[PDB]
Design a protein around this motif. Sequence first.
Motif, PDB file in Angstrom:
ATOM      1  N   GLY A   5      47.737  31.035  48.477  1.00 48.39           N
ATOM      2  CA  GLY A   5      48.044  30.995  46.683  1.00 48.39           C
ATOM      3  C   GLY A   5      47.989  29.879  45.932  1.00 48.39           C
ATOM      4  N   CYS A   6      48.371  29.036  47.376  1.00 46.93           N
ATOM      5  CA  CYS A   6      48.747  27.340  47.185  1.00 46.93           C
ATOM      6  C   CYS A   6      47.697  26.608  47.676  1.00 46.93           C
ATOM      7  N   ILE A   7      47.308  27.160  48.551  1.00 48.46           N
ATOM      8  CA  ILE A   7      46.353  26.807  49.743  1.00 48.46           C
ATOM      9  C   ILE A   7      44.546  27.842  49.273  1.00 48.46           C
ATOM     10  N   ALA A   8      44.749  28.555  48.110  1.00 48.25           N
ATOM     11  CA  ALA A   8      43.751  30.091  48.082  1.00 48.25           C
ATOM     12  C   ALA A   8      42.592  29.174  47.042  1.00 48.25           C
ATOM     13  N   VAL A   9      42.438  28.356  48.198  1.00 43.18           N
ATOM     14  CA  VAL A   9      41.047  27.405  47.178  1.00 43.18           C
ATOM     15  C   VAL A   9      39.730  27.937  48.213  1.00 43.18           C
ATOM     16  N   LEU A  13      37.616  34.503  47.332  1.00 42.47           N
ATOM     17  CA  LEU A  13      38.504  35.326  46.794  1.00 42.47           C
ATOM     18  C   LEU A  13      38.700  35.460  45.229  1.00 42.47           C
ATOM     19  N   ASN A  14      38.984  36.546  45.332  1.00 43.90           N
ATOM     20  CA  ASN A  14      39.224  36.682  43.848  1.00 43.90           C
ATOM     21  C   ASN A  14      40.067  37.939  43.655  1.00 43.90           C
ATOM     22  N   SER A  15      40.267  38.156  42.339  1.00 40.63           N
ATOM     23  CA  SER A  15      41.443  39.465  41.878  1.00 40.63           C
ATOM     24  C   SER A  15      41.356  40.986  42.013  1.00 40.63           C
ATOM     25  N   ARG A  16      40.615  40.914  43.345  1.00 41.46           N
ATOM     26  CA  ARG A  16      40.682  41.934  43.920  1.00 41.46           C
ATOM     27  C   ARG A  16      41.498  41.598  45.561  1.00 41.46           C
ATOM     28  N   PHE A  18      42.628  39.038  45.709  1.00 43.51           N
ATOM     29  CA  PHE A  18      44.169  37.816  45.683  1.00 43.51           C
ATOM     30  C   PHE A  18      45.136  38.798  46.091  1.00 43.51           C
ATOM     31  N   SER A  19      45.163  39.987  45.837  1.00 43.58           N
ATOM     32  CA  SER A  19      46.814  40.872  45.859  1.00 43.58           C
ATOM     33  C   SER A  19      47.180  41.085  47.462  1.00 43.58           C
ATOM     34  N   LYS A  20      45.834  41.090  48.093  1.00 41.74           N
ATOM     35  CA  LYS A  20      46.125  41.318  49.255  1.00 41.74           C
ATOM     36  C   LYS A  20      46.041  40.728  50.603  1.00 41.74           C
ATOM     37  N   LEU A  22      47.453  37.637  49.734  1.00 43.62           N
ATOM     38  CA  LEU A  22      49.040  37.428  49.884  1.00 43.62           C
ATOM     39  C   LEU A  22      49.908  37.807  50.370  1.00 43.62           C
TER      40      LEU A  22
ATOM     41  N   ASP B  32      34.391  40.817  38.855  1.00 40.24           N
ATOM     42  CA  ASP B  32      35.098  40.410  40.200  1.00 40.24           C
ATOM     43  C   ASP B  32      36.359  39.545  39.755  1.00 40.24           C
ATOM     44  N   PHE B  33      36.708  38.785  38.521  1.00 41.86           N
ATOM     45  CA  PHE B  33      37.659  37.621  38.399  1.00 41.86           C
ATOM     46  C   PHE B  33      37.992  38.690  36.698  1.00 41.86           C
TER      47      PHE B  33
END
Lengths: 60, 107
Positions: A5-9, A13-16, A18-20, A22, B32-33
């Motif tokens: 999340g802080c290195i989420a560069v 990586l997207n909204s689907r 991301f939750s998984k 972290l 996706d976003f």
Amino acid sequence: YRCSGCIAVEKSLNSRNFSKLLHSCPYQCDRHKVIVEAEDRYKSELRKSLICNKKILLTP
Amino acid sequence: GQRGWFCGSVSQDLRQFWVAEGGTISDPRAADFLFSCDASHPDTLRIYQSLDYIEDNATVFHAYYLSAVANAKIKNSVALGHFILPPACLQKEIRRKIGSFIWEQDQ
Ligand SMILES: [Zn+2]
């Protein structure tokens, strides 16, 4: 410094995903520990609203 | 390939930037976003109360993520995690819990 999340560069990586991301991460910063716990509370209450309501009965 | 939608309460500037730059840009219903500048009573609620949000298949990000990238070099840096946009009913307590001092930690 590792912390999802802080290195989420990284790309893809997207909204689907991301939750998984972290949840899978061994080390999480305080800000994301707080947000996650807050979001889990919200999601729990949606579930428990569906199972409780006031009229829904549990019957076979 | 980066599909992304925007709630009604998003600056057209941010939408324009999304169109202009990124992966292959498209903006469908599911996408996706998930971008928004609000979490009170906009279209965004339709995410928060979807089964996808409940089942950890949907995270709403604040559309200012795009502003941050636009003011970055190109696309590098600017981690997503900083722009997590939680439901407004949580935000009041999230701020306090983060801002509080170690001798407080009220909960
Ligand atoms: Zn973090």
